[PDB]
Design a binder for this molecule. Structure first.
Ligand SMILES: N[C@@H](Cc1c[nH]c2cc(Br)ccc12)C(=O)O
Ligand SMILES: N[C@@H](Cc1c[nH]c2cc(Br)ccc12)C(=O)O
Ligand SMILES: N[C@@H](Cc1c[nH]c2cc(Br)ccc12)C(=O)O
Ligand SMILES: N[C@@H](Cc1c[nH]c2cc(Br)ccc12)C(=O)O
Ligand SMILES: N[C@@H](Cc1c[nH]c2cc(Br)ccc12)C(=O)O
Lengths: 528, 528
C-alpha cells in the first residue's frame, strides 16, 4: 500500500476549505484530511464574485443545493461585469460619462455563448454592420439579451425558479468558508485543528514530513496543501520555490476596501458586478442583500494609500475618518511551479491577479480539480507533478494576458497610470489574438453548446475566454476589426439569417423585461 | 467591389470536385467556379476509405442523401481499420499469426468516443485491470462494442436503416469524382474545361492572373486552387514553393495496387479496412460489393517493384503476369506553405501521407473547409493566409507523428525495413504524448459528447486523435502505461461505476451480433 494516507491543508479561508471539501469527496474517504487554520479576527465582508461553473462543478459535486448555500452566505446574482468610464478621462465617479458619439461610457461582459449563423458567430455579423455604418447599436446590446435585463435590473430567474439566462454569484467569502468548514467537518470527517504553525520539518529528500503547531503538537502527513495566502509558508518559505513577479504586465498592486449599506427596497439590486475606472486604477462594486462591497484597486507607483483612500471615499461619499477600511498589498504573478515535491499550492499561495474578471475562486477550483485528476501515490511521479504545473501556468498566463488587454486598449491617457499601461509589453499570445481579431477572424471560437460548456468543466477549461469575451472587451473599449470577415461578402443568405438572430435578441430581451421579477424581489423570495 | 469574381481549380479527381462542389455552396453563387481537368485514361478502382464526418460535414452540406451517392459509387461500410500481423515477424499473409502470449495478432482502431466514469475514460479502467492481471481482454474488445460486431461481420445499420453504431465508408474514388462532377455542373453552374494546362501567367508581384490550355484558350481568374496532384503544377512549379520532405519520419514511398473479385456470398463482406503488415511495408484491403481494392505500400529502398509485386500477388494468390496492376511513387511531407499569394493547394498538391489511417479525403475537406472560413478578397490579407497555413501544417504534422508511432512502437525488427524504422526519431510533440500516456494520464481527452463531436466539424478538428485513438495504437502494439492512473487507487466507487460500463459494452455487442443483419445483406438491399 503506497497510497497517500494523510493530506494536511495549511490555512483555512475559501481556498483551504474548498480543497478540504472537494478532496473529501474525490478521495472517497480513503485519505485522512486535516486542516490547520489559525483563528483570526473576522473582518467585514467586502464581497467576492464568481463564474457560472461554480455550482455545477463544485457545489453539485458535493451534493449541496444552490439555494442552501446561498442563504447561508447572503448570496446575490451576477450576470456580467459592467465596466464604467474606462474610455473617458476624469476623476472617479459611479455615474458614467458620455462618449464622443453621445453614447454612455459603459459596456458589459456577460456570460454564455453567442449564437452562430452558417458557422459564423453573431459578433461577426454585428461587426460587419457596425463597420459599414448599417447599425448604431453597441455589441453587448445587439448580441446579448442579458444587456436589456441588466439595464432593467431584472433577475436571471423567474419566481418559480425557471432559468432565464446564465448567471454567477456574489457572496461574502468568509461566510462561504464557514459554510464549507461545517460541511466538511460534520459530513466528511475532516479534522479541524485551530492553531498556528511554527516550524516545517523536512526529510533528506526535501519532502515535508510534519508541521509543528504553536501548542507543541506535531501534525504528520504525506501530502501538504499550502493555502496560507500571499506568505506561501510552505511553497515559498519551506520549499524555497521562487515566485515569478509579473508586475511588468499589470501595474496594480494595492487595494482599499469596505462594505457600504445599501437601500435595496428604494434603489433595487444590480444583477452584476461594476468596474468603475479611477485615476490610478479601478473600483469594484459587488452588490449583495442589504449592502454592496467595494474596493479600489490601485498601483502605489501612481497613488499613495491616503490618495487612494480619499478618492475611494469621494466615490461613495464616505467619511474617511469614520469608516472601517481594509488595506491590502498583494503580489501579482505566480510561482515558478505550483506543485513542488509533496507541496501543492492553491489560491493566493500559488498565484494571483487583480479581481478584474473574477479569477480568484475559479483559480482555486481549477487547481483542486486538477489535483484530484493528478493525485499521486507516495512515489510522486515527476510526470504527474509536471503535468499539473503545466495546466496551472497555462491557465494563469492566459487570464493574465486577457486582463492586460483591458488596460492596453483603454483609450484613456489622462493620468500617468493610464499612460503607463501603454508602455508595458503585451505577451506574444495576446498579440497573436489581437492580430487575428483585427483581420475579422474569430478568436477562440466556441465548438460546443452551452449545455456541454457549463456542464463539463474540462470543456470550459480548454476554452475559458471564448470569442464572445474578446469581442466584449475589444469592442467595448473601441477596438474594432480592420474590416468585416471577408467571407461575409460572399454570403448574402447568411447575413439575412443573422438578421433573424438579431431580432430574437431584441424579442427575448423585451419579453423578459416584462415578465421577469426584479433582482430585489427574487432575493427576498430566496432569503425569505 | 473588391471581391474574388472567378475561382479556377486546376485538376479534377476527388480533390478538384470536392472543392468545386463545396465552394459552389459556401460562396452562394456569388463567384464563378471553373475546373480545368485533363482527360485521363480510367484506371482500375483500388478503393478509398473515409472517416464518419464525411456525410454530415460534406454531403449533407450539399444536400446529397447518403444512400443516393453510395449507390452511384458501389460504396460499402467501414467501422474501423484492422491491423494484422504488425506485432509478429514473417512473410505477408492475410491470416493473423499468434503472439507469444497466445493472443491473435489483430487489433482494431474503431470510431466513436469512449465513455467515462468519474471524469476518467474507460481506457484507464481497462489499463488498471490489465496491468494488475484482473483481465486478459484486449483494449479494443473491452471498450468498443463495435469490435464484437466486426468480428461477426454485421452491418452498422439494421435492415430498416436504424443506426446501430458509428461508421464511415469505402468507395471507388473515380466514381465519387464523377458523381460530384455531374452534381457541380448540372446543379451548381460550375464550368468544366476538359483540357491540359500549358502556361501559368503571373503579374509583376507573382500573382497568377490566368492559365493557358493546350488548345490555346486562356482561363482568367482571381484565386487559383492547385489540385494537380504530386506534381504541384501551381504551388510547386509555378509559384516555386518548396516541398518539405519528411521521409526521416516515414520510410514508405511506393505502392502497387489492383482490384480483386470477391465471392461475397461465400465469405461475406468485412465492415472494416484491413492493414496487413508485409516484409517491406503493408497492404490495405478495402472491401466493396463484389470486389475489394488492395494495395501494397512499400519502400523502394528495401524492395524493388518486382519484389513488392510478387509479395503482393502472393498475398491474394494472383498471377503476376496476368493481373492488372497500378504502380505509384509518392512523396511524403507537405509544402512549406499550403497557400502562397493567390494559390491554394488542396489534396496531393498540398501534402500527403500513406493511407494508413484514411487521411486523404479528410485532408481535402479540412482544406476546403478552412478555405471557405478564410476566404479572401482581392487584397489577400496576409493574416488570412497565415492562419490558413497554420491550420494545415498543424493538422498534417499531428497526423504525421501519429502514423510514425505505428512503425516506431511496432515490436517487429525482423526485416531491414522494420529494423530501419527503429532508427528514426520521434518528433517532440509525440514524445510528450508518449511520456504523458506512460504515466497513466489521458492524452487528448475528449471534452464533448459524440453528437457535438461528429455534428460540428470545428469540435473534431480541435481534437482529431483523441485518447481512445492513442490507446488503440499504443496498447494494440503492446505499449502500456508504466502503472495505472494513481487516482484510481483512491476511488473504489469509481472503479465499480466503470464495471457497469464494461458490462454495457458486452451487453450491446452480444445483443447486436444476434439481431443485426450481415454487412453483405445490408449491401444487397442498398444496391438492389
Ligand atoms: N532536519 C529537519 C528537522 C528534523 C529533525 N528530526 C527529524 C526527523 C524526521 Br523523520 C524529519 C525531519 C526532522 C529540518 O531541518 O527540517
Ligand atoms: N511517523 C513518521 C516518521 C517519523 C518518525 N519519527 C519522526 C519524528 C518527527 Br519530528 C517527524 C516524523 C517522524 C512517518 O511514518 O511518516
Ligand atoms: N468561461 C467563462 C467566460 C466568461 C464570459 N463572461 C465572463 C465574465 C467574467 Br467577470 C468572467 C468570465 C466570463 C464563462 O462563460 O463562465
Ligand atoms: N476523429 C476521428 C478519430 C478516429 C477514431 N478511429 C479512427 C480510425 C480511422 Br482509420 C481514422 C480516424 C479515427 C473519428 O472519430 O472519426
Ligand atoms: N543503425 C544504427 C542506428 C540505430 C539506433 N537504434 C536502433 C535500433 C535498431 Br532495432 C536498429 C538500428 C538502430 C545502430 O545500429 O545503432
Amino acid at each position: 500500500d503506497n497510497r497517500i494516507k494523510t493530506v494536511v491543508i495549511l490555512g483555512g479561508g475559501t481556498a483551504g476549505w474548498m480543497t478540504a471539501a472537494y478532496l473529501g469527496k474525490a478521495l472517497q474517504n480513503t485519505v485522512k484530511i486535516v486542516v490547520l487554520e489559525a483563528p483570526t479576527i473576522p473582518r467585514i465582508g467586502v464581497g467576492e464574485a464568481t463564474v457560472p461553473n461554480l455550482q455545477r462543478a463544485f457545489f453539485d459535486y458535493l451534493g449541496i443545493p444552490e439555494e442552501e448555500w446561498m442563504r447561508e452566505c447572503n448570496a446575490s446574482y451576477k450576470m456580467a461585469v459592467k465596466f464604467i468610464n474606462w474610455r473617458t478621462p476624469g476623476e472617479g465617479s459611479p455615474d458614467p460619462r458620455t462618449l464622443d458619439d453621445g453614447h454612455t461610457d459603459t459596456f458589459h461582459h456577460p456570460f454564455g455563448l453567442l449564437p452562430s449563423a452558417d458557422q459564423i458567430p453573431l459578433s461577426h455579423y454585428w461587426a460587419a454592420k457596425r463597420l459599414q455604418g448599417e447599425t448604431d447599436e453597441n455589441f453587448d446590446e445587439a448580441c446579448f439579451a442579458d444587456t436589456a435585463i441588466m439595464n432593467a435590473k431584472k433577475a436571471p430567474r423567474f419566481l418559480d425558479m425557471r432559468r432565464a439566462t446564465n448567471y454567477a454569484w456574489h457572496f461574502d467569502a468568509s461566510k462561504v468558508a464557514a459554510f464549507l468548514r461545517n460541511f466538511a467537518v460534520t459530513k466528511q470527517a475532516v479534522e479541524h485543528v485551530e492553531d498556528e504553525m511554527t516550524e516545517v520539518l523536512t526529510d533528506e529528500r526535501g519532502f515535508i514530513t510534519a508541521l509543528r503547531t504553536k501548542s507543541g503538537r506535531i501534525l504528520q502527513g504525506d501530502l501538504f496543501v499550502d493555502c496560507s495566502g500571499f506568505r506561501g509558508l510552505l511553497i515559498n518559505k519551506a520549499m524555497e520555490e521562487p515566485f515569478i513577479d509579473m508586475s511588468d504586465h499589470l501595474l496594480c498592486n494595492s487595494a482599499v476596501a469596505t462594505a457600504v449599506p445599501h437601500d435595496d427596497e428604494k434603489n433595487g439590486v444590480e444583477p452584476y458586478t461594476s468596474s468603475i475606472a479611477m485615476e490610478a486604477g479601478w473600483t469594484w462594486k459587488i452588490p449583495m442583500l442589504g449592502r454592496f462591497g467595494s474596493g479600489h484597486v490601485y498601483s502605489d507607483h501612481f497613488a499613495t494609500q491616503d490618495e487612494a483612500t480619499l478618492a475611494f471615499s469621494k466615490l461613495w461619499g464616505l467619511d474617511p475618518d469614520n469608516t472601517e477600511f481594509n488595506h491590502v498589498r498583494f503580489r501579482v504573478g505566480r510561482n515558478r511551479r505550483a506543485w513542488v515535491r509533496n507541496c501543492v499550492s492553491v489560491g493566493l499561495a500559488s498565484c494571483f491577479v487583480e479581481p478584474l474578471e473574477s479569477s480568484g475562486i475559479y483559480f482555486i477550483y481549477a487547481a483542486i480539480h486538477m489535483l484530484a485528476k493528478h493525485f499521486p501515490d507516495k512515489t510522486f511521479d515527476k510526470v504527474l507533478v509536471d503535468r499539473f504545473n503545466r495546466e496551472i501556468e497555462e491557465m494563469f498566463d492566459d487570464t493574465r494576458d486577457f486582463l492586460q488587454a483591458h488596460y492596453y486598449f483603454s483609450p484613456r491617457v489622462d493620468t500617468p497610470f493610464w499612460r503607463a499601461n501603454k508602455e508595458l509589453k503585451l505577451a506574444d499570445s495576446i498579440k497573436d489574438k489581437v492580430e487575428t481579431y483585427r483581420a475579422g477572424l474569430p478568436v477562440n471560437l466556441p465548438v460546443t453548446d452551452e449545455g456541454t460548456y457549463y456542464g463539463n468543466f474540462e470543456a470550459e477549461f480548454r476554452n475559458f475566454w471564448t470569442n464572445g469575451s474578446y469581442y466584449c472587451i475589444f469592442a467595448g473599449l473601441g477596438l474594432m476589426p480592420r474590416n468585416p470577415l471577408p467571407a461575409l461578402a460572399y454570403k448574402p443568405q447568411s447575413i439575412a439569417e443573422a438578421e433573424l438572430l438579431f431580432a430574437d435578441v431584441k424579442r427575448k430581451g423585451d419579453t423578459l423585461v416584462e415578465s421577469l421579477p426584479s433582482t430585489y424581489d427574487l432575493l427576498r423570495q430566496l432569503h425569505g
